[PDB]
Design a binder for this molecule. Structure first.
Ligand SMILES: [Zn+2]
Ligand SMILES: [Zn+2]
Ligand SMILES: [Zn+2]
Lengths: 635, 101, 481
DNA sequence: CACACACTCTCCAATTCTCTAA
DNA sequence: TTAGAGAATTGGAGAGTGTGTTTTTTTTTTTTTTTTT
């Protein structure tokens, strides 16, 4: 029924060690007491959570052992049963917290009034010719931060390594955050007002559910045998921010033939919204059973479900000068292009085109400034790795296979609807990298058109009559039917994209896996090195770092260059000849889309050289990307 | 409704029915302590005819082509089957609140 | 001496709150707002000297309308009332209830003290309301947290949907089973304060008093589900959404898919673990209780209608970027106005097809027409199934691009590559302005009534001029005709 | 199982009824 | 006639008994019909 046992712990000792630690401890070895100074920030309301570094308590115990006084192994208590010590540290803090030194503007808070009226009522009663639960007045959240390696809270666990033997302990868990709740208020202390006796009473909640009070029990209500009625008041309740998250083990950790298991993480208080889905993270936390309550507790039996209370969070992963440190090296255009995907060797004009997606043309009023590029031709050319490199390099980039539109989605996961924003809405004011572009449904394919023509997508279901703004540059790639491209034939013959779509790109670029003894040796020597030496081979130039490349581009974009008179004079002198030669064999004719294209391309080159406007030494290169693309369609 | 008391075999009659089914709270015989255990007399009790018809806002009236809003209409007596699905009708009567019984 | 009235938990006096707000609700010249923000060069005698809320209230009385909008910044503009703005943000439910009644007191004072000749009961019977707005900085729905419970907040979002209207009881109505006596019983925090006994002392029977649902009195509640606006989202994940309860006169303010700005008190409520017990879940359902919602001459005709150049002017100004194509502009213009209609056949709808190489601005014309036209829709030939362009029946009308645009231009592109099952939708629409369906007990006809603007490419390569238009689109003559 | 709600049973004392003397 | 002591009936405390509660519901395969393939 209820026997009792001699455990080698005494919480009266350890409460004395904890209060003795808090008042005494200073990290003066960094050359007043650390936690006293911290508590002053709490008392002045400049701070809302107290982080206790377990690595400090070692230095406390080390100093006390060096003084020859045997501190009572406190870290080995609070790793081994962390939950109870959240109560002891809050008691030790409250007993020691200093009076405020800055003005609070006290009477803006409700509890300062309620508890004062409760104080005065007790004096005016008790003249006669705890006071309330302390959790109600704790304006701060306590968290432990675990040991760094210098011990079980140090070693990060995969989710399957967390056996039932770990329950109650402080642990560290490694994984991806797979999903996250919206933040909701949990109650901690519920305040009620009695209608008749005019007296406040508090219920404290420590479970997934609770039962409300309804009938008054204040001294002056029960003494007057008045059946007072209690009503809940949210204004005087204490809530905490609660957010539930799910963590999954990493693909490296799963043993051969198993499935990636998961834990529920509960994050409470100031630590909330520190987790985002797809983070790889180490969460340290207190591992616990969530006990079923009410009828389910009987039938569920001894089989407790479980969760982790978050305590601290470790993510796994000068600007204004660094752009000059690029510029003052010179030849920025060719070096930035050669620095797109440096692992792919050759194909320079493609890299020199793709760079102009990142930078883009200019919008006007509306008229599109965004640039559309379609890569084309043989498989094994690594177009997917190049699209992937642009997805990592580009600001606001999104990779998405055909293997896409926004739509109403009814009961995803929780039993509620959402208007889901497709990849073309994820790519707002950025690059949409659509790989396997021809493996697409007509309902998505014809929704590419409205992103071109209207800079938007439209919805027409469940009464949702909405348009979503969706300005984005499209990078596309496609692969040929019959396994290899036929040089006897057009792109229109090898690929199912119609000219009414295919001719909407500012650049279409045919790139091919052409066999040739030297070119095949140059490729095969690179591949056979990467099987001997696990890092990339010697580039024989130094590339721009992607972070410094992004930092350049964000600054280069906003300069929005304007026309100079010789540009508009010159561009017609090319365009007319391009029309005249298109008069004279596929579909590659000089549409006005190609005039607009040369404009947007020349704008993207003008941005890269950082000026208010630029001379036609620029424009002549934009014409070369187009001219080389057409010669690449023929060969 | 009309009921007979199983405890004393008395009869209660003209028992008006709200949205819920409703037996008498007290036996009419002053010898009887009963407040429950009633049986319906199906000969003496009287039944209306009734029909629910579900109607919606007209497909030409919906102001922007949004979702059609619906209403549950109750028909009684002679008014039952006087309409058919896909038809357009004008009904007149009271708006009512129906409890979740 | 006086038993002071205090907002619970606050040390705020309701008399001082009232007697300040009255002396703002008159004597506030709009001048003071143009001192608050400055722009003080701009001050104009006619608006700015007028007593702004006096003019607002005299309008309310004469229109017979019960709701006063209030830009909360006015409370900061007026010296006496700066602390009331802070009370309105911090204690909304009480401060709004003081403002609601002060309006009603003012409406009466404005006729009885002013001794003006008007109907008093016409004002005494009204439930007046303030609707405060412009309350503070807007915030992200994702940035809400329990510090904000029972405060005014300002949100922007997209309406996903509305429930049909919900009756919320405001007065219960009770009848004595023994004696036929009856009572109006006040609802309080959602609990019916039921009587123990008949109120007639000549009856006084316990438990015999009973509720009559259709003699109770009700308010209108509606739930709107509101999604987070895409500008605010962190780009790593989906938008959030929040339910909001809209009440009384604000019910059906919004259509589905409206962008709106709302001012409301942020609320939390416990919810039952099981519907037969009072056991409650330890984390509360949250919503906003809204108090305001905001969305997102003939002589000028004569300037145009007298003109010599008129037909060419209108043609050169419906689509001013588009180079030449003058006869295309000239005909599309006639499609915007349309012909004439009659009832007792033919109708004033007009239908236009564009045909030619994909390499030209004709699709941009189809865009300008969608920009200019009243009503109307833009789509394309491959762009949906047939029933997605016409109509369908579901778990109830599905409606497509060929419907809900009476007299409005139905723009369609890619019309040559529309599937033939989907081409075969149009004959009943284009020849009889109408659609017929029968399924699942529904027998029905729908009026389609759209002027179609179609656009088409040549199949494959450049349109050859020798060969005929019927061939070169690959499209059936009885639909082309 | 066990813990709240629904509902009946029983006892006890609190109030009002009725009679008597101050 | 007031007022105070003794007798009867009603209210409700509270003890006792009895009942219901977890809860889900897409997913994945197999089939048979329309039509759009
Ligand atoms: Zn009380
Ligand atoms: Zn009976
Ligand atoms: Zn009565």
């Amino acid at each position: 029924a209820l026997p009792s046992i001699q455990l080698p712990v005494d919480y009266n000792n350890l409460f004395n060690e904890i209060t003795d630690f808090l008042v005494t401890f200073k990290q003066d070895t960094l050359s007043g007491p650390k936690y006293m100074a911290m508590l002053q920030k709490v008392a002045n309301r400049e701070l809302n959570s107290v982080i206790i570094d377990l690595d400090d308590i070692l230095q406390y115990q080390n100093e006390k052992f060096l003084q020859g006084t045997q501190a009572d192994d406190l870290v080995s208590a609070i790793q081994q049963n962390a939950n109870h010590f959240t109560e002891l540290f809050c008691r030790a803090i409250d007993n020691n917290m200093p009076l405020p030194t800055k003005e609070i503007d006290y009477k803006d808070d409700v509890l300062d009034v309620i508890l004062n009226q409760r104080r005065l009522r007790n004096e005016r009663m008790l003249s006669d010719r705890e006071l309330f639960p302390p959790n109600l007045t704790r304006r701060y959240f306590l968290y432990f931060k675990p040991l760094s390696q210098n011990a079980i809270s140090s070693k990060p666990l995969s989710v399957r390594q967390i056996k039932g033997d770990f329950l109650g302990q402080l642990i560290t868990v490694r994984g991806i955050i797979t999903r996250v709740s919206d933040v909701k208020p949990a109650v901690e202390v519920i305040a009620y007002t009695c209608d008749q006796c005019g007296y406040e009473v508090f219920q404290e909640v420590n479970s997934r559910t609770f039962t409300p009070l309804s009938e008054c029990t204040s001294e002056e209500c029960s003494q007057n045998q008045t059946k007072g009625q209690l009503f809940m008041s949210t204004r005087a309740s204490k809530f905490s921010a609660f957010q539930e998250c799910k963590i999954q083990e990493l693909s490296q950790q799963v043993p051969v033939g198993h499935i990636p298991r998961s834990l529920n993480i509960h994050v409470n208080g100031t630590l909330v919204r520190s987790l985002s889905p797809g983070d790889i993270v180490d969460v340290t936390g207190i591992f616990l059973p969530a006990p079923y309550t009410g009828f389910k507790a009987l039938k569920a039996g001894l089989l407790t479900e479980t969760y982790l209370e978050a305590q601290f969070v470790r993510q796994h992963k000068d600007v204004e000068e660094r752009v000059m440190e690029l510029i003052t090296s010179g030849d920025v255009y060719n070096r930035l292009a050669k620095s797109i995907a440096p692992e792919i060797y050759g194909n320079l004009d493609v890299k020199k085109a793709l760079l102009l997606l990142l930078v883009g043309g200019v919008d006007k009023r509306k008229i599109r400034g965004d640039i559309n590029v379609c890569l084309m031709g043989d498989p094994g050319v690594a177009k997917s790795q190049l699209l992937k490199a642009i997805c990592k390099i580009s600001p606001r980039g999104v990779y998405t296979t055909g293997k896409l539109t926004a739509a109403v989605m009814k009961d995803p996961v929780t039993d509620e609807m959402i208007l889901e924003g497709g990849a073309l809405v994820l790519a707002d004011n950025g690059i949409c990298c659509i790989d396997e572009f021809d493996k697409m449904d007509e309902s998505d394919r014809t929704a590419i058109h409205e992103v071109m023509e209207q800079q938007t997508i439209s919805i027409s279901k469940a009464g949702i009559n909405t348009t979503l703004n969706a300005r984005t540059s499209i990078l596309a790639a496609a692969n040929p039917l019959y396994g290899r491209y036929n040089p006897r034939l057009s792109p229109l013959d090898n690929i199912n994209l119609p000219a009414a779509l295919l001719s909407r790109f500012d650049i279409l670029f045919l790139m091919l896996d052409i066999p040739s003894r030297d070119d095949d040796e140059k490729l095969a020597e690179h591949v056979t090195y990467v099987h001997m030496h696990n890092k990339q081979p010697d580039l024989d130039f130094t590339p721009v770092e992607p972070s410094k490349m992004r930092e350049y581009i964000a600054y280069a974009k906003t300069k929005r260059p304007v026309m100079s008179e010789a540009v508009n004079d010159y561009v017609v002198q090319a365009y007319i000849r391009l029309r005249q030669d298109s008069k004279r064999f596929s579909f590659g004719q000089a549409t006005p889309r190609t005039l607009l294209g040369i404009i947007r391309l020349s704008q993207a080159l003008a941005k890269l050289r950082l000026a208010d406007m630029v001379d036609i030494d620029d424009v002549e290169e934009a014409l070369r990307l187009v001219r080389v693309s057409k010669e690449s369609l023929y060969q | 409704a009309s009921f007979t008391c199983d405890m004393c075999r008395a009869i209660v009659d003209n028992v008006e029915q709200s949205f819920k089914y409703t037996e008498p709270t007290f036996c009419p015989n002053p010898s009887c302590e009963n407040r429950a255990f009633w049986t319906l007399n199906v000969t003496r009790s009287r039944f209306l005819d009734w029909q629910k018809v579900r109607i919606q806002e007209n497909a030409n009236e919906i102001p922007t082509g949004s979702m059609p809003r619906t209403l549950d209409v109750i028909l009684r007596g002679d008014s039952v089957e006087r309409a058919k699905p896909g038809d357009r009708c004008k009904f007149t009567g009271v708006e009512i609140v129906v409890p979740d019984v | 001496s006086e038993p002071l009235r205090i907002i619970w938990g606050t040390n705020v006096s309701i008399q001082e709150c009232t007697t300040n707000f009255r002396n703002f609700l008159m004597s506030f010249k709009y001048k003071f707002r143009k001192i608050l923000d400055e722009r003080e060069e701009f001050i104009n005698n006619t608006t700015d000297e007028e007593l702004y809320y006096i003019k607002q209230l005299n309008e309310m009385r004469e229109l017979g309308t019960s709701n006063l909008n209030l830009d909360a910044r006015n409370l900061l503009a007026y010296k006496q009332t700066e602390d009331l703005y802070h009370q309105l943000l911090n204690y909304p439910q009480e401060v709004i209830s003081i403002m609601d009644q002060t309006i009603k007191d003012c409406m009466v004072s404005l006729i009885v003290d002013n001794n003006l000749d008007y109907d008093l009961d016409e004002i005494e019977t009204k439930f007046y309301k303030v609707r405060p707005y412009n309350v503070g900085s807007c915030k992200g729905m994702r940035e809400l947290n329990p510090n904000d419970i029972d405060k005014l907040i300002n949100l922007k979002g997209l309406v996903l949907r509305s429930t049909p209207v919900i009756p919320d009881m405001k007065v219960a109505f009770f009848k004595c089973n023994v004696c036929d006596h009856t009572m109006a019983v006040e609802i309080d925090r959602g609990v019916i304060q039921e009587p123990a006994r008949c109120e007639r002392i000549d009856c006084n029977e316990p438990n015999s008093m009973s509720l009559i649902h259709n003699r109770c009195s009700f308010a209108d509640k509606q739930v709107i589900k509101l999604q987070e606006t895409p500008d605010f989202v962190p780009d790593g994940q989906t938008p959030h959404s929040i339910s909001l309860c809209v009440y009384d006169e604000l019910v059906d303010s919004c259509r589905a898919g409206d962008r709106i700005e709302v001012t409301g008190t942020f609320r939390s409520i416990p919810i039952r673990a099981n519907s037969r017990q009072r056991v409650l879940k330890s984390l509360y359902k949250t919503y906003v209780d809204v108090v305001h919602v905001k969305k997102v001459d003939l002589a000028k005709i004569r300037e145009v209608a007298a003109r010599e150049d008129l037909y060419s002017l209108l043609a050169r100004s419906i689509a001013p970027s588009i180079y030449e194509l003058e006869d295309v502009k000239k005909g599309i213009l006639l499609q915007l106005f349309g012909g004439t209609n009659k009832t007792f056949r033919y109708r004033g709808d007009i239908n236009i097809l564009l045909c030619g190489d994909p390499s030209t601005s004709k699709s941009q014309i189809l865009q300008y027409v969608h920009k200019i036209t009243p009503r109307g829709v833009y789509t394309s030939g491959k762009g949906s199934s047939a029933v997605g362009l016409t109509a369908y029946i579901t778990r109830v009308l599905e409606s497509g691009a060929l419907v809900l645009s009476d007299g409005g231009v139905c723009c369609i592109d890619e019309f040559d590559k529309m599937s033939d099952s989907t081409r075969s939708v149009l004959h009943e629409v284009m020849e009889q302005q109408t659609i017929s369906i029968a399924k699942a007990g529904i027998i029905t006809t729908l009026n389609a009534r759209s002027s179609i603007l179609a656009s088409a490419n040549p199949i494959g390569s450049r349109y050859n001029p020798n060969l005929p238009v019927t061939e070169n689109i690959d499209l059936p003559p009885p639909l082309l005709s």
